[PDB]
């Protein structure tokens, strides 16, 4: 059926430092509209399976 | 930059009848525990971009 329980980050405001950990799960606003925690246009979840 | 505005359904309890429109956005339960509106382990969003 496929393993869909492994994910990875796909979006961030900036890069990451060496040996740095990011665990925050916030909606990524890639446009000019307040997402307000709404998954939609220019509002993409930062994790992909 | 990649187009992400298009999504398609990936999981459903059953198949679709001919000429059917589905729009429900509900967390899917692939395991034996309630999802409780959290896309965590064995609980995946139905739409993929």
From Swiss-Prot, chains A, B:
UniProt name for this protein: Spike protein S1
Subunit structure: Binds to host ACE2. RBD also interacts with the N-linked glycan on 'Asn-90' of ACE2. Cleavage of S generates a polybasic C-terminal sequence on S1 that binds to host Neuropilin-1 (NRP1) and Neuropilin-2 (NRP2) receptors. Interacts with host integrin alpha-5/beta-1 (ITGA5:ITGB1) and with ACE2 in complex with integrin alpha-5/beta-1 (ITGA5:ITGB1). May interact via cytoplasmic c-terminus with M protein. May interact (via N-terminus) with host bilirubin and biliverdin, thereby preventing antibody binding to the SARS-CoV-2 spike NTD via an allosteric mechanism.
The species this protein was found in: Severe acute respiratory syndrome coronavirus 2 (2019-nCoV)
Region (Immunodominant HLA epitope recognized by the CD8+): 3-11
Role this protein plays: Attaches the virion to the cell membrane by interacting with host receptor, initiating the infection. The major receptor is host ACE2. When S2/S2' has been cleaved, binding to the receptor triggers direct fusion at the cell membrane. When S2/S2' has not been cleaved, binding to the receptor results in internalization of the virus by endocytosis using host TFRC and GRM2 and leading to fusion of the virion membrane with the host endosomal membrane. Alternatively, may use NRP1/NRP2 and integrin as entry receptors.
Result when mutating residue 15 to K: In strain: Omicron/BA.2.75, Omicron/BQ.1.1, Omicron/XBB.1.5, Omicron/EG.5.1
Record-annotated disulphide pairs: 35-43
Annotated region described as Disordered, given as residue ranges: 10-45
Residues covered by region (Receptor-binding motif): 1-49
Organism superkingdom: Viruses
Outcome of swapping residue 41 to V: In strain: Omicron/BA.4, Omicron/BA.5, Omicron/BQ.1.1
């Amino acid at each position: 059926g496929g393993n869909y329980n492994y994910r990875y980050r796909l979006f961030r405001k900036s890069n990451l430092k060496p040996f740095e950990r990011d665990i925050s799960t916030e909606i990524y606003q890639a446009g000019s509209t307040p997402c307000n925690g709404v998954q939609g246009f220019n509002c993409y979840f930062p994790l992909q399976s």
